[PDB]
Design a protein around this ligand. Structure first.
Ligand SMILES: CC(=O)Nc1nnc(S(N)(=O)=O)s1
Ligand SMILES: [Zn+2]
Ligand SMILES: [Zn+2]
Length: 257
């Protein structure tokens, strides 16, 4: 089964998922001097006030917080998007050390972790259909750097102990995702893919310029999770990030100058 180890990591994925060597793979390195400022990009519209979180789960690769996506409660629109995109989940990627952990990089700079807020285009009916379309998903990427603590992330940090191993899940209601957003919504956007198998090329990536700060104690708790299931030899869940892929003549557009 795929993973992030020496024998089943990113460099091996192409054997089971040939699309890994595709034309629009993610993540990528964002070269800030080559990115094109596009004055026609509209501001992002994030409406998370009616968001309903359900559970938090350790899937053996990272941990996800899932939301009720049966209605337009938490949606993303505007920016480079056409139509309404419904929030379904958010997940993180982190490193074993503070100088690595993010998937996307900015001018080769790696951040301590990266948050992904996944949304699917409502015109497709369900998430399963959306992943088969070139404009099926919109993922909002937020960088995390170590500094002062992020109050809004603490609820997540505190519950990690209950979902320590692969397969564990816990009820996680009333979590407000607005507490994870940076102050500015300036962004870079480019057409890409999911960063984990099946690596489908169905994502419009929206990467925020401004990182959020989290404390050392907060990220330390992420590193306590396990890749393994209960009762198996312990493998700490760290470095669950995919390296930057070739841009291959796609253009990264910026909403700011
Ligand atoms: C069910 C679902 O959302 N799966 C995802 N797989 N990888 C994702 S990512 N890391 O690109 O956000 S989202
Ligand atoms: Zn799996
Ligand atoms: Zn992710």
């Amino acid at each position: 089964h795929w993973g992030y180890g020496k024998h089943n990591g990113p460099e091996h994925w192409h054997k089971d998922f040939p699309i890994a060597k595709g034309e629009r793979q993610s993540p990528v390195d964002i070269d800030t001097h080559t990115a094109k400022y596009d004055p026609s990009l509209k501001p992002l519209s994030v409406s998370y006030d009616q968001a309903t979180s359900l559970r938090i789960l350790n899937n053996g690769h990272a941990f996800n917080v899932e939301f009720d996506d049966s209605q337009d409660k938490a949606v993303l629109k505007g920016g480079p998007l056409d139509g309404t995109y419904r929030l379904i989940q958010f997940n993180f990627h982190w490193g074993s050390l503070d100088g690595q952990g993010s998937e996307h990089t900015v001018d080769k700079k790696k951040y301590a972790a990266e948050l992904h807020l996944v949304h699917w285009n409502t015109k497709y009916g369900d998430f399963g259909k959306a992943v088969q379309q070139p404009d099926g998903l919109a993922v909002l990427g937020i960088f995390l750097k170590v500094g002062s603590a992020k109050p809004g992330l603490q609820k997540v940090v505190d519950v990690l102990d209950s979902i320590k191993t692969k397969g564990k899940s816990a009820d996680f209601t009333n979590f407000d995702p607005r507490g994870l957003l940076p102050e500015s919504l300036d962004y870079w956007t480019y057409p890409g893919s999911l960063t984990t198998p099946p690596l489908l090329e169905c994502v419009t990536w929206i990467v925020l310029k401004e990182p959020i700060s989290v404390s050392s104690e907060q990220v330390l708790k992420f590193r306590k999770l396990n890749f393994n299931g209960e009762g198996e030899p312990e493998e700490l869940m760290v470095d669950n990030w995919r390296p930057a892929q070739p841009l291959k003549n796609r253009q990264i557009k910026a909403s700011f100058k």
